[PDB]
Structure formats: structure tokens, C-alpha cells
């Protein structure tokens, strides 16, 4: 069975792209999915994947985005959710998408500083169907 | 494995969907009828989901509905948003999901109170299911 | 495949715990999940479940409306897994709680609220379910 579940970490850099860590409660033994550069999940096998994120952030429009990338292919949106305590809320994204070997999915946000990083807060993962 | 993911269509309180872009229609055991209804072919257990985004500019209500063959339609799920009021447009995403048992020929679709407020920009609004 | 979907029923402002029924278009896939005492979803088998609920709602202050997903586990005290807290008439709003959790044999989950009187019970507005992964 092919699945990764990965957890948020403060990005350090500039971008809208969230940075993730292999801090999960499961061991992706397989390698059929990998976390590259703490930014993206890259799969090795072609398939129908259920892909998800949860993004927890502080308020005071906020948009999370699940995107798809591949060598030779500009980034492309798969999913987007908008939202309008410390104002704290959650965006959840999830869907089925067909993925090819080498493909990567990643998450990006309008404001990375607003987001809450701990385990239990912001995650991102998938599982092959 | 039987699964569908369908994309919002540039448009009628019942939302339209397109088989275009990064959509998925695993097989002929699921299909999109009239660009409006996901109709399954086999009986079983389905996670069904929907995301509606809208200018939160009475509450906006999105509903998931079921047309079983031989039976009048019923509501499956509904979500309400009270939108004060809430900026220039004030985009909001509303999601509906559940585990439902479906009959051959069963079709689900998604209803909304104000079709003019829904966002069609890429990724914002989508509909699918998968067999469990 | 182990899954549940239950429907809201009205309840007294005497408990904070919400009430559910196997009525209308519900799911109780097999004997390994049940709805106990109109109130808790109880699993016979251990493992990884995705648990979701959606509650729709409308005072002496402007204290938020708050919904809590609770876990009761054999020989354990109850604990809170998730809280959603929200800041007319009436101002109909849906709030969602959900996530994935490792449940022990005979674990029970339920939903707490602030004002059960204000929760909407019209068809499809308030719901509770789970799915073993
Ligand atoms: O948030 C989810 N959606 C976003 C969402 C939420 C709410 C609403 C919506 C929405 C979208 C559109 C419209 C409306 C609403 C979206 C979500 C999360 C997870 C999930 C999360 C995690 C994860 O928190 N994990 C851990 C970690 O690692 O720290 C745990 C944290 C604490 C407990 C133990 C570790 N773990 C797993 C999981 O199963 N994992 C983890 C990695 C491998 C292992 C499985 N495994 C074990 C042995 C071998 C393999 C799965 C799975 C799934 C998932 O599938 N759903 C979601 C429900 C149905 C579907 C079930 N199906 C069946 C096959 C595919 C889809 N949706
Ligand atoms: C890949 C993609 O869909 N990109 C769009 C781009 O067209 C738009 O101009 C940009 C502005 O930030 O936001 C996004
Ligand atoms: C199953 C169901 O709820 N059907 C309703 C119907 O009762 C109502 O008369 C109509 C207009 O509001 O909308 C539809
Ligand atoms: C996990 C949790 O919050 N348990 C609480 C406990 O702290 C408290 O004594 C009581 C107050 O009503 O409610 C229950
Ligand atoms: C969609 O259809 C239902 C059932 O046919 C109807 O009662 C309702 O008014 C509609 N739901 C919404 C949210 O507009
Ligand atoms: C809900 O959860 C527990 C019951 O065990 C309790 O700590 C909390 O006070 C409850 N919430 C409300 C609003 O009563
Ligand atoms: C991040 O990704 C897309 C793809 O390039 C970009 O268009 C968008 O502006 C960014 N996402 C958000 C949520 O701003």
C-alpha cells in the first residue's frame, strides 16, 4: 500500500510554498512516494490517488492551494479553498487525481507567516486507490 | 477502482460540471449525466464529496442531493454560510462529504441557493465520489 | 469495510452531548460499528479511522458557539479531539470537525456543543460519521 503523510514546518525561505517534514506517525517503508526538498510529494507509480491537505492558520482572503508539477510541465492547480483562537481556522482540501510516475504535488498559501506548524495542525498526504 | 472527480462549469440552482482538465472518470461504472449528475452503475458504499466556493457577498446554502431510480429525490447533506458581508466579494469555500450507500443507477448532484455567487476559477469548485 | 453515517435528532438543553439516529439515509455498514444510546459511535475493531461531523446552528453574552469531538476509550477518561468555535435572526451556520485517529477496541466518539437548542435538525444539516482506513 502506497501512502505518505507529512507534517508542516516553518519554511525559513520566502515563498507561498509550504515546507514539510517526515515527522509522521507512519514510516513510508516503500519509497514509492518521497518528500523532495521538503516541498513536494513525488510518486513513482502511475495511479488514482486521493490527495489531501489540511491547513490551519490565524485570521485577521486566505487561500490554500494544491498544485501539480512535473519535469517539463509548469505548475498547475488541482484544488483551491478560500477563507474569510487567534482567529484560528482550517482549510481542507481533498480529491481524486490520476498521477504519473515522476509527478509531484505541493501546497501553497497566500500568507505563510499566518500558518500554524505543529503536528496536529497542518498536514499533507496521499494514498493510492 | 471506481472514482470520479469533476470540475465546475462556466454557466439554474443545480451546478454544472465538466469533463475537462484534471478530471477523472475511472470507468464506465460512473458517468456524468447532462453535465449535472454523477450516476453510478454498481451498488455499494461511496464516499461522496463536494467543494463549493462563492462570493459570500439570508444564508448561502449548498446541498448534496440524491436521485435513486424509482424514488423521488432526497437531500443528503446541506451546508449554510452566513456572510456579513463580507468584503468586496469575500470568497468562501464550503465543503460537503459523507459515506453513503448507493443503488444501481443512483445519481447525486449539488444544489445551491444563489448560482450567481459561485466561483468558477480553476480549482475552486469540484464534485466527485469514490467506491469504498 | 467499516463505516457509519448518522442523522441528527433533537435533544434537551440538559445535555451538551448531541443525539443521532439510524433513520433516513444512514449507514452502519456492519456489526463492527454501532450507534450506542443515540449518542456515540462505537467501534469493535482497532485501527485508523477518519471521523467527520458537520453541525449547523444559529444569549446572555456573545460567547462563541463551540462543537467538540470527544473520545471515550475503555478504562480511559474522556478526552477532546477537536474543537470548532464560532463568533439574524437566525444566523444559520455550519461548522465542521474531522480528522484521523487511532481508535482502540470499544472506543467511542461523540459530539459536544454549547447550545443544543440552537442546532439545526432539518434534513441533512447536521451529521456524524466515520470510515476505517
Ligand atoms: O484530511 C483528510 N482529507 C482532507 C479533507 C478533510 C475534511 C473534508 C474534506 C473535504 C474535501 C472536499 C469536499 C468536502 C470535504 C477534505 C484525509 C486524511 C487522511 C489521512 C490522514 C492521515 C494522517 O493524519 N495520519 C497520521 C500520521 O501519519 O501522522 C496520523 C495522525 C494521528 C493518528 C495516527 C497517525 N493518515 C492517513 C492514513 O491512512 N495513513 C497515514 C499514512 C499512511 C496511513 C495509511 N496506512 C496505514 C497502514 C498502511 C497505509 C489518512 C485520509 C483521507 C482519506 O483517505 N479519506 C478522507 C475521507 C474519505 C477518504 C477515505 N479514502 C479511502 C481511500 C482514499 C480516500 N483524508
Ligand atoms: C498556474 C496558474 O494557474 N497560475 C495563475 C496565474 O495565471 C495568475 O496570473 C497568478 C497570479 O498570482 O495566479 C495563478
Ligand atoms: C426534497 C425536497 O426538499 N424538495 C424541495 C421541495 O420540497 C420544495 O417545495 C422546493 C421549493 O423550495 O424545493 C425542492
Ligand atoms: C477532557 C475534558 O475537558 N474533561 C472535562 C474536565 O476537564 C472537566 O472537569 C469537566 C468540566 O465540565 O468536563 C470534562
Ligand atoms: C435544492 O433542492 C432541494 C431538493 O430538491 C430543495 O428543497 C432546495 O430548495 C435546494 N437546496 C438549496 C440549498 O437550494
Ligand atoms: C464537551 O466535552 C467534555 C465532556 O467530557 C467537557 O469537558 C466539555 O465541557 C464539553 N463541552 C461543553 C460545551 O459542555
Ligand atoms: C501558488 O500556486 C499557483 C500556481 O503557480 C499560483 O498561481 C498561485 O498564485 C499560488 N497560490 C496561492 C494560494 O496564492
Curated annotation (Swiss-Prot), chain B:
Glycosylation site residues: 111
Outcome of swapping residue 47 to E: Decreases ITGA5:ITGB1 binding, B-cell activation, activation of NF-kappa-B signaling, and anti-apoptotic signaling; in soluble form. Slightly decreases CD40 binding; in soluble form
Effect seen on changing residue 95 to E: Decreases ITGA5:ITGB1 binding, B-cell activation, activation of NF-kappa-B signaling, and anti-apoptotic signaling. No effect on CD40 binding
Highest taxon, organism lineage: Eukaryota
Mutagenesis or variant effect for residue 51 to R: In HIGM1; decreases ITGA5:ITGB1 and ITGAV:ITGB3 binding of the soluble form; decreases activation of NF-kappa-B signaling
Mutagenesis / variant outcome for changing residue 47 to C: In HIGM1; decreases ITGA5:ITGB1 and ITGAV:ITGB3 binding of the soluble form; decreases activation of NF-kappa-B signaling; slightly decreases CD40 binding of the soluble form
Consequence the record notes for mutating residue 123 to E: Decreases ITGA5:ITGB1 binding, B-cell activation, activation of NF-kappa-B signaling, and anti-apoptotic signaling; in soluble form. No effect on CD40 binding; in soluble form
Name of the molecule in the record: CD40 ligand, soluble form
Species annotation: Homo sapiens
